[PDB]
Amino acid sequence: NGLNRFLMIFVLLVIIIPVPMVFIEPEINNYPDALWWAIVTATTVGYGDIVPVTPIGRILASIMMLFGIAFIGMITSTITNFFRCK
């Protein structure tokens, strides 16, 4: 249940956070562009095609990155502890 609780809140961020981003950012004008940026930021790829200019968007992006690196550590723990037990 510990793994499911960590991914459900992560999936919600990658779905809920792209919604306000469209309105506050002058570069983003629709949800598909913000959703694509969300995946890119959450997977720590960062192409640089879409970048938050406003400080409000930069604070929101920092949360996505902090939860993005934590997601990598959560997936790693799901495989590492799976073979360590037996």
Which residues make up the interface to a copy of itself (CB under 8 A)?
Answer: 2, 32, 36, 39-41, 43-49, 51, 55, 58, 61-62, 65-66, 68-84
**CA-to-CA distance for 35 and 29, rounded, in angstroms?**
12
Which of 48, 83, 84, 85 is in the footprint of K ion by CB under 5 A? 48
26 binds, among K ion, a copy of itself, none (CB under 5 to 8 A by kind): none
Could you say whether residue 46 binds K ion (CB under 5 A)? yes
75 binds, among a copy of itself, K ion, none (CB under 5 to 8 A by kind): a copy of itself
Could you say whether residue 44 binds K ion (CB under 5 A)? yes
**CA-to-CA distance for 84 and 28, rounded, in angstroms?**
45
54 binds, among K ion, a copy of itself, none (CB under 5 to 8 A by kind): none
